[PDB]
Each structure stands twice: as structure tokens, then as C-alpha cells.
């Protein structure tokens, strides 16, 4: 699996889970959240060589096609597999509001 | 929708369904297969700008992060959405065998 356990403990130029901490105010311009100040969103990046973490039959075939003919630009792409929610806290005046924002964090990757 | 109807009828530099024909013997080295000799597999390629055909909350957020900080290389990727199977014919000696291989053709795209 292309998760934290493998990806963060090993060097890889191929499709892997990459660490990313997104700051609400600094990075996105979101000034409304009280807590957290940012989050470990993470992202998926890296090469998709032949039979490396293929999603579908199409991904398997194109990982092969792109080995033979790179020029076609038909390579599978390094993308999200398992996503997790983020719990945030914001205020409406003195009123605290807790929201679970779904699919905010990427936990693993796939070549699609 | 990033399908044949839109993508093949219009020029697009952002994430779109691109045409691609795969010849089995030529492009993959599959000599075991009798029919077809190849197929219109297609692929997904193109830029993933802010909000362009965004899959999940994570892709919405990253299209935004990558608009602000392109340097991080954290852009969403142009990938398959809807796929179709491909019916093949192959021989085991004299015996003809009809097989359905699923998710062989990409019909629509998304930014993930």
C-alpha cells in the first residue's frame, strides 16, 4: 500500500503519498475557522511505471503503453485512494460549531 | 462532462478525454489474443485548474492550494471517471474463448 507506513519511511520517485500541511489563513485565505490552524492534507505525486500500484485494467494497460510509447502522454496518474474527514471548530458569535468536513485528508495513493 | 461529446468536439488544454488506439501485438506485445487487433482505449490528460471538474473536497482544496502555491507540485490529476469493458476472443489450442475484460476503455474524465 502507498500509505504513510511505506511512503514516509522510504525514498520513492514513483507514485507515493507526499506530506502536506495546509494552513487555513496562509495557504487558502480561510479566515473563518477557529481550530485547527491548518491540517495534514497530504497529496499524491510521482511516476506511474509499469504495474506500479495500478487501480483498474485500464491503468495496468496504460502503464504498459506509456512504457513503450512515452510520447503519447497517456501515462496513468498518481491519485488519492483512501480519504479521511477533518473535524473543525468555528464560531457564530459566541456560539461554537463543530463540523466534520469529509474527504479533506488523503491517507493512501493509487496509479489511475 | 468530460466525455467524447465535449472533448472530441472542442479544443481543451485542461483535463480532457484524449483519443488513443491500442494495437495488442504492436503496443503491448500480447500475442495470445485473436480478436480484436486493437481498441480505442483513450486516456485522460490536461491541466487541473481551480474547480475544473473536481472529484472530492480534497481535489477542490488542492486545485485552490496549487493556484496559490504551484511550486509545491501538489496539483490534482487528470484521471478516469467512467469506464467500459472490452470483449476479446482468444484460442486455447482449437478452443475459442470469449472473455470480457472490465474497465478497459475510459469514457469520461475527472480532476482527482
Amino acid at each position, epitope marked *: 500500500a502507498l500509505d504513510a507506513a511505506y511512503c514516509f519511511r522510504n525514498v520513492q520517485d514513483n507514485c507515493c503519498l507526499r506530506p502536506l500541511y495546509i494552513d487555513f489563513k496562509r495557504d*487558502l*485565505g*480561510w479566515k*473563518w475557522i477557529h481550530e485547527p490552524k491548518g491540517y495534514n492534507a497530504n497529496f499524491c505525486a510521482g511516476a506511474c511505471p509499469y504495474l506500479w500500484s495500478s487501480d483498474t485494467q485500464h491503468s495496468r494497460v496504460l502503464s504498459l503503453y506509456n512504457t513503450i510509447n512515452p510520447e503519447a502522454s497517456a501515462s496513468p496518474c498518481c491519485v488519492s485512494q483512501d480519504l479521511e474527514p477533518l473535524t473543525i471548530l468555528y*464560531y*457564530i*458569535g459566541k456560539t461554537p460549531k463543530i463540523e466534520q468536513l469529509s474527504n479533506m485528508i488523503v491517507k493512501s495513493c493509487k496509479c489511475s | 462532462a468530460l466525455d467524447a461529446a465535449y472533448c472530441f468536439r472542442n479544443v481543451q488544454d485542461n483535463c480532457c478525454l484524449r483519443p488513443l488506439y491500442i494495437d495488442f501485438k504492436r503496443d503491448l506485445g500480447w500475442k495470445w489474443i485473436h480478436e480484436p487487433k486493437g481498441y480505442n482505449a483513450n486516456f485522460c490528460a490536461g491541466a487541473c485548474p481551480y*474547480l475544473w471538474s473536481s472529484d472530492t*473536497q480534497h481535489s477542490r482544496v488542492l486545485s485552490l492550494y496549487n493556484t496559490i502555491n504551484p511550486e509545491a507540485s501538489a496539483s490534482p490529476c487528470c484521471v478516469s471517471q467512467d469506464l467500459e469493458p472490452l470483449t476479446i476472443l482468444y484460442y486455447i489450442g482449437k478452443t475459442p474463448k470469449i472473455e470480457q475484460l472490465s474497465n478497459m476503455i475510459v469514457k469520461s474524465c475527472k480532476c482527482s
Partner: antibody
Amino acid sequence: VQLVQSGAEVKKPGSSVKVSCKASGYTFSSNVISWVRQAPGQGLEWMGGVIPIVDIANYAQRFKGRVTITADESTSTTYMELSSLRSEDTAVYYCASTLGLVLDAMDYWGQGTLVTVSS
Amino acid sequence: ETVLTQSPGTLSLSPGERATLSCRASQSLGSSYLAWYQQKPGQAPRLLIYGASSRAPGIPDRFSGSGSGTDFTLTISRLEPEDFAVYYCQQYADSPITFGQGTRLEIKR
């Protein structure tokens, strides 16, 4: 940076009105958009707001059940829909972006939209 | 809901003078949850002060605010004839946001 609102409207009582507000630039993705009305009678009244991308809308009690505030991020446009219109709903409707929080000071305002509620 | 009482209702002063507008709240608003607006005829309200004392971007230095709890003040130190307007106070300490009834400021000539 500019907020451009839809034109004036006349609406029969019991009807509903959808007022638009288009934002110039890449500020839609980052700001809370508030809706405020002003009638000669009741004066300035906050109606509610919407947080974009996450699409959380919050309403003032006196309006909860009649108002809908939506954000079409594709057109960078916010919509306000007020239903079961009564004569007391005759006012100038403004969209404004807040300084940061859901309840905050509002720096950018639209030109305003006059909604007349009459038979 | 918090009630904001503005006083006086009307005020006419001459250029060069100082205007003192008052906002009195039905409950404490702290010190960072009050804004002042200027509204000219046929226009939308213009943010002057936020968080009881901070001047909003591009606002002239002659506008100033102060206060805490229930008593807030807007001050226009050297009135210009262009200072004629309706001034409103707004609280954002407690839901829902509430505004004051307004103070009309006339500029003597």
C-alpha cells in the same frame, strides 16, 4: 474587487425572490458572504451568510425557514432566496463579504437590490 | 437579541468641529466586536471602523473609535463638508448581527 448585484424586482405577496451577487476576481474562494437588508421601517437587518467551498450557510432566527443562501463557485456568484414574501420584506438587499468570521464587519458591499412586495 | 442604541438621532455641526457619536449596547460586546459604517444617499454602507477602534483599509485618519462592554464612540475630529451621512454601529459579538437605528449628521454652511 467588486460585488455586482441583480436588478430591482416586484413580487406578489406569498411569492419568492432570488437575488444574485457576482464577485470580480479570485476572492470568492476565500470570503464569507453575508446578506443584509434595509427597509425604511425596520432599518438594517442581517439575514444570514454562506461560507464557500465547504458550503455552510447560517441564518438569523427571524429568517430561518424562509431564506436560502447558495454559492455557485463556477460563476463566482452568491444567491439569496427569500420566500413567503410579505410587505415588510420590501427593502434594499445587500450582499457583503466579511473581514474573516461568519459574524464580522463587512468591507465590500454590492450596490444593493430593491425588492418591492406588492399586489 | 443585542440591542444597539445610537445617540443623538440627529446632529448638525460646522466644518472643523469634532463629532462624537454614541452606541450603547444592551449587553457586553467585549472590545473587538463592534463596527461603524457611513452611509451616503443612494449608496451601500461604508465600513469605517472595525473591532471598536481599528480603521478599515483606506479610511481617513480623522475617523476614530473607542469603547468596551456596552459603551462605544465614533469620533470625526475635523469635519469636512463631505462628512454628511447616516452613521450606523454594528455588533458581531452574539448571533444574530444587529445594527443601531442610525445617527444623521448634517454639516452646517
